[PDB]
Point group: C3
Chain length 355, copies 3
Amino acid sequence: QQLNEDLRLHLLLNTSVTCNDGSPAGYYLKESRGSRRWLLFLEGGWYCFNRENCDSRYDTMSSLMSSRDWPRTRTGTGILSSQPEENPYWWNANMVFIPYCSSDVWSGASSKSEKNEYAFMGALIIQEVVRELLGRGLSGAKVLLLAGSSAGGTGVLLNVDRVAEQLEKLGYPAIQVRGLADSGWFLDNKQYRHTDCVDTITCAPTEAIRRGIRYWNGVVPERCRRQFQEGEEWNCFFGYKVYPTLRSPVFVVQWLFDEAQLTVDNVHPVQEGLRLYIQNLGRELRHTLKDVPASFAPACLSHEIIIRSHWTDVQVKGTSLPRALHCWDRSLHKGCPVHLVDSCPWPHCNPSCPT
Amino acid sequence: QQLNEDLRLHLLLNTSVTCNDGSPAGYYLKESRGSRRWLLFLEGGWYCFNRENCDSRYDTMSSLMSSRDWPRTRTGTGILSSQPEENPYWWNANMVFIPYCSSDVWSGASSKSEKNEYAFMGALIIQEVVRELLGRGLSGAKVLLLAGSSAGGTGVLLNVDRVAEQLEKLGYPAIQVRGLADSGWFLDNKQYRHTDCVDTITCAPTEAIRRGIRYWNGVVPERCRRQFQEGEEWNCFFGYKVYPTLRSPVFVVQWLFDEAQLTVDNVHPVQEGLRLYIQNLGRELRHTLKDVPASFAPACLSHEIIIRSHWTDVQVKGTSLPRALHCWDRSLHKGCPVHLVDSCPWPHCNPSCPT
Amino acid sequence: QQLNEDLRLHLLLNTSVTCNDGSPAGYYLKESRGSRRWLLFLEGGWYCFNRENCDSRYDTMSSLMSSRDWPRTRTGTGILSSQPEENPYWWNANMVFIPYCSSDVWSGASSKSEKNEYAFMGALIIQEVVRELLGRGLSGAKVLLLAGSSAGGTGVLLNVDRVAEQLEKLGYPAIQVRGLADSGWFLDNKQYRHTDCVDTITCAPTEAIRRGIRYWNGVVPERCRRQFQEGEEWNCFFGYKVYPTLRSPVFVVQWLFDEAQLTVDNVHPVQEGLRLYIQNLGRELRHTLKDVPASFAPACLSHEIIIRSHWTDVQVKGTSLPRALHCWDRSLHKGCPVHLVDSCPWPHCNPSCPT
Ligand SMILES: *[C@@H]1O[C@H](CO)[C@@H](O)[C@H](O)[C@H]1NC(C)=O
Ligand SMILES: *[C@@H]1O[C@H](CO)[C@@H](O)[C@H](O)[C@H]1NC(C)=O
Ligand SMILES: *[C@@H]1O[C@H](CO)[C@@H](O)[C@H](O)[C@H]1NC(C)=O
């Protein structure tokens, strides 16, 4: 009933490319054969940077490490919705949802693993999903928007140029690859209270990635890798460091007080030392988006937005995000602004912040 | 009680000028002797382009073909309201409502008819109502805003210059005649599903007018008539064709997905051929307003607005219609915009669309 | 409980400086030792310009003539709130509330009075409160924002430069003194119905001040005093007259149809002579703010706003007042407008007007 309007699950045909637990990876697809725009969405949901933490994620959140519980179909929401009230400009696009089952911020390029231990093939899964879509209409595309939330937004920053190069190398160069990074723009800042790196939610962002990369056998974009010392690839997971060497255009959406950012910075009236910290965090962030011409950053304490149903409720300086994305579409073809950043300095100082 | 604040019915003194059924025509009036602005509103409500269709409209909707049921008074609403919460800039104007009883899009100029058959004197009724108002304060006016909705909005396009010339010819040339056309801006486009021209609601806009004009003995503005072949006066009912030869300033208000337009185009998730059609219709429309400097066009599926009570709820690009009308007032005496057209491509992609 | 977050009452140490009834004056204080901004708020609430009217205010409203009922603490609200949802940019400032107990529009400079009669030391109370705050962190300040509502807003206009000079003269010249005047911008216009000057709420603004000044032994700013004849100091209570000689920057917030203004103009559908009057009043007002570059003036019938909790609900031309105040902060260090004045000509023609 609703099934007839849904994205449909396809497992990958190459079974060498798997989820963490060796089960095959895949993608949900809904084609629109009146449209030439393509929306590839990278799911997020943290990561695991060593074996005991993954074993723990498997007990607790195996849905993020395995395809054994993926349903046959799913309903598109937010920018994947076909409903024009919820998705004003993109409701007619070809919709693709790639589930996150690699726990590696879509950086994994390990061809093999050993048996009884996890595989990390994030970056390969994207590569293979792109391959298969070429056989299903992607070949005829104008715009391929690689989008993602949280770990998936960071994944966009890591993979957008690799996809752009994958397609150029395959002789589809009418296709414009673009990126849209939601809640994946983080700071490698000092924690409010420094704590030891043990759990996924206590580990300072720098240390987490530094360990993750070597565990996942992760890859970062070459232009960025070459700007930092060898063994310092972790820098390339931080948006403000990787952004400038990107060749593809990328729109950056980012709550100035991201729940994930506050969690790794170990933040939980309010103490005066903490007042300072939270406040100076929104400022560091605001700072890093000055050179990012296309962005949306409200003064809210939240997490993810682009596939949430209420993504149209939030406004910055009179403007909604779908509208900002549209203006950005137009800037790649003046009353139509694409740089929207809240000046007010505390979460929920903006009143359109979602609960 | 409410009667003391209402517009009052006046039947025309010249009984040669009648409604469809031979009963006298007229106008509702409420004067404001602190104001020098005048608001003449032309009611709409379709038309009938042959004898069997009119006979059918008489059985069903004789209120639109006769004054026998007109009440003594009526309450002004929207831009005819005296309530400043509902009518921010025009609440103090002289208010005039001319009921539509000619079924001829205010184009009828038939001096006589035969007995037992309908008269079509739309354009004369306007002329006579203007005459009479000269004896009641119109003589002292600065601005005469001829306004109308639906068939009445089209009537504005057909009659605004004739009124302007009527007054010049009568030696009242301090009076600025302006127009305001609501839901009267139509396209002469192909139907989604072509159907035969039989009922008022199935007949393609082109064919309906082509027949109506010859039945009503209709008149179009001379400047427009002369731009098209003889026997092609019907073109002059289409706003984008008649607009450029208008001498009077005209503000154009128009839902991009007008219910009336969808009805004559014979439109009723959604089929893919229909997706295309509705979408390309909002685009054709948007297109035709590019050269119309003063306009308001939301991405809504609706019908009429200027005398509806909730006319202030709808916004385009942060701006309400009364505000847009004000800015337009100012442009005839820069933070104050008068060209407001929704870019989003589907009805109710704008969230301020009324139900 | 709430007490721990509140402003705390301090009575003045110099007991020569009193409220009307000889009881000591004072101020509520809440310091924020992460902030260098200071917010001094002057309460309002009319005045009494002769002995029988004061005796009457003492029976009825002794809270405004005495400190005997002042509570130990009070909760900051609006621009004095520490809650960032209610106070987006200023929630972290040092907060000061000076209660109005002098009945003299903060103009009183009578060192002494006789016994059994009232003292009017408004201007001295401000001077003494500023003195004491120097011993508590004001010394280290960047910005001192003198703010007030109603009689307190007028008091800001009367005292902002005196404070600026008090501090310069005391050798604290890193401190930028600014003003924020809320509902204290009045017209010295003709009453709608002229009535005799007897009660505080019937007395034309001109006559009230003319009498008050000589009774309170009031002082006006020197630059303004010198622009008018001797014995015409009352002019200097009217914002549009005093504003141009101000040296300190002042932001002016003012409902175009202020309840207090309507009360002294003796205003209570609506009569045609009264329609004219109210309308031409909003226009005179609008007029007087043309040269005031930094202002906020909605088309509402209201009174006071800056410490009311809903101060963020009202918008003018898409912009809230806290936002306008912020832009103004920025202009003293282009998408950020500070001149916001409703063009619509009747109270509640703006829909964001508070009830
Ligand atoms: C998976 O299989 C396809 C088709 O044989 C191939 O082109 C692709 O590169 C393969 N990937 C790996 C890791 O073997
Ligand atoms: C109707 O009567 C008036 C007054 O005699 C006249 O001026 C007007 O032109 C007449 N119209 C017709 C159609 O006879
Ligand atoms: C009040 O006392 C203080 C401290 O002695 C003094 O500096 C101030 O000027 C006094 N004011 C009056 C009116 O005596």
